[PDB]
Each structure stands twice: as C-alpha cells, then as structure tokens.
Amino acid sequence: RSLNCTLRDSQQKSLVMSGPYELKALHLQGQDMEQQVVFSMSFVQGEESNDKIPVALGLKEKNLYLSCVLKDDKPTLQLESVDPKNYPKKKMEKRFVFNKIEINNKLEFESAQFPNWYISTSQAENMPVFLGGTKGGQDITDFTMQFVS
Amino acid sequence: QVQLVESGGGVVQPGRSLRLSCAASGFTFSVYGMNWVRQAPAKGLEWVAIIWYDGDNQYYADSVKGRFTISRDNSKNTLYLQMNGLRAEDTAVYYCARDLRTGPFDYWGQGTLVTVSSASTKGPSVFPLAPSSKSTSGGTAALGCLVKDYFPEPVTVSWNSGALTSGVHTFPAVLQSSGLYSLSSVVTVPSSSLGTQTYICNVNHKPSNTKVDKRVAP
Amino acid sequence: EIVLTQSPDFQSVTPKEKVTITCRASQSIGSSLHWYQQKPDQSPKLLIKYASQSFSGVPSRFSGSGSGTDFTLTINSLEAEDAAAYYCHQSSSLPFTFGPGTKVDIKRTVAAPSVFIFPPSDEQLKSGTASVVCLLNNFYPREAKVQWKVDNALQSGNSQESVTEQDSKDSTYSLSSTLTLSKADYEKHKVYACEVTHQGLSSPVTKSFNRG
C-alpha cells in the first residue's frame, strides 16, 4: 500500500528539490506551491505500535528514496538512487525505514536505522532538509501531510 | 505571463568561446529551475544543462561537461550559458527552458542560433525568379527570389512587407561546400495582378547589415 | 545515461484517425516521461507531463499512457495542424535525455505538383554564375524525384534540393531544386529541363526552356 503526498513543516515551509540528491525547505506563495516535492509514502514491515508506524519515503517523480547513513560518523539524511523496478518493497532495507509518529495533529519521521534522530528543517529560509537529533529546540521535526489526488 | 527571451547567439570560431543569456519574466524566477536545451539544424532535441532555483547546484549533459557552464542571476532574472572549447558539433539553436519540479520543460524560449565555424560573414545576393510563361499554370503565376551565398543563418524573407502570405513557400536553406548558405522563397499569385501589383521580396540578413527589397518584375 | 527509443521515426496517418507513438526507456523511469510537440519554425511545447497528465492549454485529443519502461502518446481524431515532430523526455534521473523524435504526416488525397522552371536571372548572369530553379508546388505524398537534364544529359554533383515540412492547413509539401553552372558552361548548352516523377502525375512531366 502506497500514497502520494506533499509534506510541509510546522512553520508552513514547503519542501523543494535543490540538487540531484538535495531537498530544501522554504515558504512558497500561491501559484509557486506547484514546486513542492511529491513524496511516495509506502507502509513497510517492521516494529509496529500505537505511537509508531513504519514507512518508506520515495520521491515519486524521481528514482530516489530518503535514506539514513553515517557521514563523518554522524547520522545523515540522504537521497539514494534506486531501481524503480524493484521498489517499493514490503520488507524495506533499514536505512530507508522511518517511524511515522502522530504528535499534536502533526507528523514526525524518526529514523529506524538511528532512533531519536528525525527528518528536520531549519528555522531559516532555504536551508537543506536534514536528520536532526534534537526534539523541541532549534530544529523543526513536525510536519503536515497534504494528499495529491 | 511567462516569457523567456534568449540573446548572444552568433558566429564563433572552433576552439573559441561564446556567452548566451536568457531574460525571464511572468513568474517567480528565483523558485524555478532553468535549463538549456539544444537542437542542431534538421536534428532532434538534446538537454544541455540545468541550474536549480537558488543557483547553488548545476548538472550537465555528457556532451558539454567540462566545457560549458550554466549560471543565473536572480536579482536580474537572467539565465546564462558560458560555452568554451567549441567544436563544429555544437552548432545548434539553443533554447532557454523552465522546468516544473525538475521534471517537464513547461515553458520554452524562442531559441538562439550558435554557428561554430571558421567561415566569414557574407551578405546574400538577391536574384529575382521572374514570372514568365514557363512559370504560369492557367490563371496562376509563380515567382520568387533566390537568396544566394550568405553566411551565417538565418535570413528572414517576407513578401510585400508581410502583406502576402497565401501561396508563399520559403525553403529551408541548403549548406554549400564553400560554407555559404543558399535559399529560395516562392509565391503563386493570380496572373491578372502582374503589372498592377508590385511584388517585392523583403530579404533581411542582420549579421552582414544586408536589407534587400528586390522587385520581381514579369 | 537512460536511453530513450522512440517508435516510429515517421508515421503517415489518415485524418480523423488515431496516431500511436511509443517511447522506450533502457531503465525503469516510473512515471517521469514527458511529451513535446514541435511544429515547423516553432520552439517545442509541452503536451503531456508525468506520462498521463495533459498540460494547461493542451486539447483533450492528446493523451499519454505508460509506466516503467514503455510509454505511449496517442493523438485521437487527427487534424492537419498535428503534422509536426513529437519528442519524449525522461526526468527520473540525471542526465536528462530525449527520444530521437517522431514526424507525423497527415494522409490527404493525392495531389500532383504544379511544376515551374526559372532560368537564371540577368542579374546573376552579370556576376558570372547561372542558377536554374525547378519548383514543385503543393504536392502529396512527399515522395517526389527531380532530375536535371541539360541537352539530353543527366546532371550530377551540380544541384541541391530543399523540401518544406508538411503544410499545417492543406497537408501538402513543396520542393525547390537549384542547378548551378558557371556562366561559361551555361552558355555552351541550349535545352535546360527538370524531369519530375510523382504519383499525382499520369506520366513523368518535363518542364524545359531554350536558353535563346
């Protein structure tokens, strides 16, 4: 099972492609909202609970999936090139698995490979989307989902 | 709304350089990715380069990588293409194109021609193709203009300052051995009009400052 | 890079009928396959985005289908204005690539060309050159052969021809052929003819003139 969506942070910044494997978060006005990245959210096998739901986040219009890997021995968010013929899988590789958390009517995406690290945005305009360890501080970890047809 | 206007096209010797620019309007330039797409005369389309909205990242085709540089100025709504180490194979119409979500090229410019050769700029000789008994079928007479030995492309041909369009056929230019081009523009008109209505082929070749208004008399 | 194979390279179709053009990717591209139309003397234009979505302003007769490696562009109820070039482009991964293109010919009733011959102008002869022009006006189909005959001798390596793209209104083609000789060689011969062979003509037509 899969669904197409757009994700916006709690400060209402939209997510856009910034490079071949880079995403940035910025406020987009009116007609420019068509620029927001379309995500392919797949429900994968893993640790299930009332608080956490395992998901895989693909770029839908790209052969890319959000991945968590060690870069300079620090958990880092990346966009990994994949073969669309083989993806989405029911049993997805750990690095691609995210725990979808429902907070106060908002969504959180925790890394399964690196627990307590979340998909994050800066408070600042036009900064890269990254994996952040802090929850309830500098980094924004809360998101709103908008379904696309 | 959306407008993309290219400039900087022209003649450049092989091995030399040329800088193209594209003026954009009617959209938030700073939030859209911009591209260069090229098309060699009588050939298909080939994606050249991309620059993302903020100008931080760029990507190039294998055929131009290391020779061409794509850049943008969001304060001036302009996209640039710096072309170095140019070879004969680079001869093409270069289109400015906006992308949607780094996907389809939703809006395109008019394109700018880049001619990569050692040939010298030369104005055309405009010869009349006079209507006669050998170029008349019933009540319709065919006449024209031969736009011979010019360089580079393009030439604009209109009939009677653009007032005559029906039956007009302007032929795609043929490249000769010499490196010079040649074309023909014809028009089929009623025979009764001959002698009363003046038939002028307006030939304009901007690179050589040539502007010929040739009278095609029968 | 992802290789895009476009089939066919050329297709002649009856008006009001359906045209189907395929695009094949060397690797799976999901739904990131876009379609473009390029009419003669015009810049390309987006028709279909993301395999099946019609772009703003595109008529309902243009439809797209496909996923993974195989993609199709369908043109229902074919009109004369659809005589153009069509291109597929993938955006799934970098570098972005295009298919080689498909040219669409509209199949109208057979039309013979009206053949016209033009001797070299007095102005050109004054400069020391002589160009003889043979015009083939408004014919269908595109298949036409022009041969230059000078005093019953078949000419070679001294002529160039140019053909227009299919007319968006009358679905015909026009052809121009130019025979070039020096002023000296031109003055040595008398009979200048262009022989035209086309389906519309009951017998191969010859349009000629005598130099004098």
User: Based on the domain organization, do C76 and C15 belong to the same domain?
Assistant: yes
Q: Closest-CA residue in chain A for C33?
A: A61
| Residue indicated by tokens 């003649």 | B11
Domain count, chain B: 2
**Cα first-last separation, chain B:** 47
Q: Please tell me which of the candidates A17, A28, A32 has its beta carbon nearest to residue B102.
A: A17
User: Based on the domain organization, do C144 and C73 belong to the same domain?
Assistant: no
Nearest to C97 by CA among C34, C21, C189: C34
User: Based on the domain organization, do B54 and B143 belong to the same domain?
Assistant: no
Q: Are C73 and C86 in contact (CB under 8 A)?
A: yes
Q: Are C162 and B174 in contact (CB under 8 A)?
A: yes
Assigned token pair, A6: 């757009």
Give Cβ neighbours of residue A13 (< 8 Å, ≥ 6 apart). A25, A26, A27, A121, A125, A140
For chain A, domain boundaries: 1-149
User: Based on the domain organization, do B125 and B75 belong to the same domain?
Assistant: no
Other CB atoms within a 10 A radius of the CB of residue A1 amount to: 8
User: Based on the domain organization, do C7 and C102 belong to the same domain?
Assistant: yes
Positions of E strands within C84-166: 85-90, 97-98, 102-106, 114-118, 129-139, 145-150, 153-154, 159-163
Question: Which residues of chain B are within 8 Å of residue C121 when distances are taken between CB atoms?
Answer: 127-130, 146
User: Based on the domain organization, do C70 and C102 belong to the same domain?
Assistant: yes
> Which backbone phi and psi does C111 adopt, to 5 degrees?
-130, 125
Alpha carbon distance B132, B187 (integer Å) = 13
Q: What's the burial of C173, exposed, middle or buried (CB within 10 Å: 0-12/13-18/19+)? A: buried
Nearest to B101 by CA among C25, A38, A58: A38
Q: What's the burial of C183, exposed, middle or buried (CB within 10 Å: 0-12/13-18/19+)? A: middle
Resolution in A: 2.0
| Domain residue limits at B45 | 1-118
User: Based on the domain organization, do B200 and B92 belong to the same domain?
Assistant: no
Distance from CA of A86 to the nearest CA of C (A): 9
Q: Which of these three, B118, B144, B177, is where a domain ends?
A: B118
Question: Which residues of chain A are within 8 Å of residue B33 when distances are taken between CB atoms?
Answer: 17
CATH code: domain of residue C92 = 2.60.40.10
Q: Are B61 and B118 in contact (CB under 8 A)?
A: no
Q: Which residues of C touch A (CB under 8 A)?
A: 27-32, 50, 68, 91-94
Q: CA A144, A146, B1, B7: dihedral to nearest 10 degrees?
A: 70
How many CA atoms within 13 Å lie on the side-chain side of B191? 10
Domain count, chain C: 2
User: Based on the domain organization, do B91 and B133 belong to the same domain?
Assistant: no
| Domain residue limits at C19 | 1-107
* CA dist list (Å): B12 to A99, B179, B210: 57, 14, 20
As assigned by CATH, the class of the A1-149 domain is mainly beta
User: Based on the domain organization, do C194 and C143 belong to the same domain?
Assistant: yes
User: Based on the domain organization, do C112 and C15 belong to the same domain?
Assistant: no
Q: Look at C89 and B105 and tell me if their CB atoms are within 8 Å.
A: yes
Alpha carbon distance B158, B160 (integer Å) = 7
Question: Which residues of chain C are within 8 Å of residue B127 when distances are taken between CB atoms?
Answer: 120-121, 123-124, 131
Alpha carbon distance B95, A54 (integer Å) = 45
Question: Which residues of chain A are within 8 Å of residue C97 when distances are taken between CB atoms?
Answer: none
Assigned token pair, C80: 């004369």
Nearest to B108 by CA among B118, B98, B122, B117: B98
Q: Look at C127 and B125 and tell me if their CB atoms are within 8 Å.
A: yes
User: Based on the domain organization, do C28 and C70 belong to the same domain?
Assistant: yes
What DSSP character marks residue B148?
E
User: Based on the domain organization, do C30 and C94 belong to the same domain?
Assistant: yes
Nearest to B124 by CA among B18, B21, B205: B205
Strand partners, B12: B116
Alpha carbon distance C198, C1 (integer Å) = 43
User: Based on the domain organization, do B81 and B127 belong to the same domain?
Assistant: no
| Residue indicated by tokens 């004098």 | C212
Question: Which residues of chain A are within 8 Å of residue C68 when distances are taken between CB atoms?
Answer: 84-85
Any A CB within 8 A of B1 CB:
no
Alpha carbon distance C163, B170 (integer Å) = 10
CB proximity under 8 Å: B 71-130 to C? 95, 99-100, 102-111, 125, 127-130
Q: Please tell me which of the candidates C27, C68, C94 has its beta carbon nearest to residue A20.
A: C94
CA angle B44, B47, B50 (to 5 degrees): 165
Alpha carbon distance A94, A111 (integer Å) = 9
User: Based on the domain organization, do B96 and B182 belong to the same domain?
Assistant: no
User: Based on the domain organization, do C77 and C170 belong to the same domain?
Assistant: no
User: Based on the domain organization, do B162 and B76 belong to the same domain?
Assistant: no
User: Based on the domain organization, do B98 and B7 belong to the same domain?
Assistant: yes
User: Based on the domain organization, do B187 and B123 belong to the same domain?
Assistant: yes
User: Based on the domain organization, do C30 and C99 belong to the same domain?
Assistant: yes
Alpha carbon distance B159, B136 (integer Å) = 19
Question: Which residues of chain C are within 8 Å of residue B106 when distances are taken between CB atoms?
Answer: 46, 49, 55
Alpha carbon distance C194, B67 (integer Å) = 48
Strand-strand pairing, B168-170 and B181-190: antiparallel
Distance from CA of B169 to the nearest CA of C (A): 7
User: Based on the domain organization, do C68 and C170 belong to the same domain?
Assistant: no
Q: Are C203 and C116 in contact (CB under 8 A)?
A: no
Does residue B172 have a cis peptide bond before it, meaning omega lies within 30 degrees of 0? no
Q: Look at C93 and A81 and tell me if their CB atoms are within 8 Å.
A: yes
Q: Closest-CA residue in chain A for B53?
A: A18
Q: Which of these three, B96, B118, B140, is where a domain ends?
A: B118
Strand-strand pairing, B112-116 and B10-12: parallel
Question: Which residues of chain B are within 8 Å of residue C135 when distances are taken between CB atoms?
Answer: 135, 142, 144, 184, 186
